[PDB]
């Protein structure tokens, strides 16, 4: 999963 930071990054 490269899109780990598009749907839910380390700011939610």
Curated annotation (Swiss-Prot):
Organism domain of life: Eukaryota
Signal peptide boundaries: none
Record localization: Cell membrane
Tissues expressing this chain: Most abundant expression in the heart and pancreas.
Family label: Belongs to the G-protein coupled receptor 1 family.
Purpose: High affinity receptor for urotensin-2 and urotensin-2B. The activity of this receptor is mediated by a G-protein that activate a phosphatidylinositol-calcium second messenger system.
Protein name (record): Urotensin-2 receptor
Source organism of the structure: Homo sapiens
GN (gene name): UTS2R
Residues of the whole record sequence present: 154 to 165 of 389
